[PDB]
Amino acid sequence: YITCLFRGARCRVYSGRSCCFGYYCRRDFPGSIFGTCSRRNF
Numbered sequence: 001y002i003t004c005l006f007r008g009a010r011c012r013v014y015s016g017r018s019c020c021f022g023y024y025c026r027r028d029f030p031g032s033i034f035g036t037c038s039r040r041n042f
Contacts, residue, residue, distance in 0.1 A: 006037070008037075025037050
């Protein structure tokens with residue numbers, strides 16, 4: 001249960017802990033409150 005948000009999970013803007021290392025949380029569309037975790041870009 002104790003872990004970070006990994007790829008394939010839901011996450012909102014005002015969610016709790018941030019996403020895992022190398023992964024952030026993006027929104028769904030212009031004017032949304034919830035989104036999903038995606039892999040970073042390099």
